[PDB]
Enzyme design. Structure first.
Site, PDB file in Angstrom:
ATOM      1  N   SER A   1     -35.036  44.736  25.916  1.00  0.00           N
ATOM      2  CA  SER A   1     -36.051  43.788  25.446  1.00  0.00           C
ATOM      3  C   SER A   1     -37.480  44.049  26.018  1.00  0.00           C
ATOM      4  O   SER A   1     -38.447  43.451  25.545  1.00  0.00           O
ATOM      5  CB  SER A   1     -35.592  42.350  25.667  1.00  0.00           C
TER       6      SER A   1
ATOM      7  N   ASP B   1     -42.344  33.862  27.945  1.00  0.00           N
ATOM      8  CA  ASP B   1     -41.232  32.929  27.876  1.00  0.00           C
ATOM      9  C   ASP B   1     -40.645  32.811  29.293  1.00  0.00           C
ATOM     10  O   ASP B   1     -41.381  33.022  30.259  1.00  0.00           O
ATOM     11  CB  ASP B   1     -40.225  33.382  26.790  1.00  0.00           C
TER      12      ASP B   1
ATOM     13  N   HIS C   1     -39.729  37.347  29.769  1.00  0.00           N
ATOM     14  CA  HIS C   1     -40.559  38.431  29.326  1.00  0.00           C
ATOM     15  C   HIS C   1     -42.038  38.346  29.641  1.00  0.00           C
ATOM     16  O   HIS C   1     -42.648  37.284  29.532  1.00  0.00           O
ATOM     17  CB  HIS C   1     -40.359  38.612  27.833  1.00  0.00           C
TER      18      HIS C   1
END
Length: 397
Positions: free
Chosen positions: A128, A365, A368
């Site tokens: 990610s 968030d 991240h």
């Protein structure tokens, strides 16, 4: 699963012979700053306003890719002229699609016959921290929510590999798969060595491909230690297998990076101090394996670069003001828990983040980094004498 040797030369001829056409979906940020992740699209047009099309062929094993001789610069230009966005954070991206029901397919520009040793593309492997849309297309554009996470990126904008590719005027072909909490519901958890194998099957359909002219980027383990509770010895084996696979396939240019201390992310405000120390010790130990793998491939004669993302993320979280940031401990978005379900929904920014702007926050968030952090990592990797001088880049006037 599937290996490049499964593909025969009769199949390569047959796939390359099928010269068809497709349309281009041009995406753009609708908002005028990184605080707003929402995107919209239009089909690419020719200068006269008629729909633009690219000639070429399709290939996949299950997750179709379109191979064309149309340059990447031409496609971007056609999307820029069509949308005519007059704000600074347009952050335009483009994909192959036959119609409105089709999802976002990568466009690959086939290499020419006349080729020397210059770097002509970037190929990304990761999680990610690098994913630009693979879990998103698998989730039929539901994960992460496109109102709050910038079109399949686990951020509010471009990831670090996209900013490196922009600075070097190169296309970026992403194989990274986001492994954030809830990702396992769309595709089963596979190694980074399975991303290398998937890549290798696609590169076998490409024309005039020379893997010595690819700049590979590799970052893994963040999601493996953060939520999949993997053992260091297993992630070590998956990492080394991937490097053996890439270099046996002819890779010569590889960019590697240590993992940032995940335990500094806002989600760990809701974790035990025991879970903090346990996750941190895994990262510290694995970073030492990343550093050794790099020194081993330098002695073997490969063009390796290693970036201490961990050292940077310590500096960022320790003193965010020194690096141009205001907050390094809170999520910019008003998310006050660590839950996989939250990627399915849209969220507002906190009052504090709307006041300072998301460009002043380290975290988007609960896990991240913001696009400003991604841009900062890329700027540092691009700096004179920071390692990239060892790669053969083209010049652009």
């Amino acid at each position: 699963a599937l290996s490049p040797e499964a593909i025969t030369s009769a199949q390569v001829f047959s796939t390359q012979s099928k010269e068809t056409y497709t349309y281009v979906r041009c995406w753009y940020r609708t908002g005028n700053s990184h605080d707003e992740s929402a995107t919209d699209w239009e089909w690419a047009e020719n200068p006269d306003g008629s729909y633009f099309t690219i000639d070429g062929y399709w290939w996949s094993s299950v997750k179709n890719m379109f191979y064309t001789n149309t340059s990447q610069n031409v496609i971007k230009q056609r999307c820029e002229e069509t949308l005519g966005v007059t704000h600074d954070a347009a952050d335009i991206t483009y994909f192959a699609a036959d119609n409105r029901w089709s999802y976002n397919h990568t466009i690959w520009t086939n290499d020419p016959v006349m080729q020397a040793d210059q770097i002509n593309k970037i190929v990304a492997f990761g999680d990610s921290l690098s994913d630009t849309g693979n879990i998103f297309n698998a989730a039929q554009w539901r994960f992460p929510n496109p109102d709050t996470w910038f079109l399949g990126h686990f951020s509010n904008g471009f990831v670090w590999t996209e900013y490196i590719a922009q600075a070097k005027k190169l296309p970026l072909y992403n194989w990274a798969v986001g492994g954030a909490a809830g990702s396992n519901q769309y595709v089963a958890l596979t190694g980074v060595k399975d991303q290398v194998l998937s890549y290798l099957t696609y590169a076998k359909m490409a024309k005039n491909y020379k893997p010595e002219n690819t700049l590979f980027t590799l970052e893994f383990g963040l999601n493996d230690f953060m939520n999949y509770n993997r053992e260091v010895v297993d992630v070590k084996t998956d990492f080394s297998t991937a490097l053996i696979k890439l270099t046996d396939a002819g890779a010569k240019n590889i960019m590697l990076m240590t993992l940032p201390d995940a335990t500094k992310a806002p989600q760990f405000k809701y974790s035990t101090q025991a879970e903090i120390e346990k996750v941190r010790a895994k990262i510290v130990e694995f970073n030492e394996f990343i550093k050794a793998q790099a020194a081993f491939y330098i002695i073997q004669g490969y063009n390796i670069t290693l970036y201490d993302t961990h050292g940077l993320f310590e500096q960022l979280t320790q003193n965010p003001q020194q690096h141009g940031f205001v907050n390094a401990s809170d999520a910019c978005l008003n998310i006050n828990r660590a839950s996989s379900a939250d990627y399915l929904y849209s969220h507002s920014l906190t009052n504090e983040c709307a006041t300072h702007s998301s460009d002043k926050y380290v975290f988007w968030d609960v896990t991240h980094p913001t696009t400003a952090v991604h841009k900062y990592i890329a700027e540092k990797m691009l700096a004179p004498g920071a390692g990239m001088q060892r790669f053969n880049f083209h010049h652009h006037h």
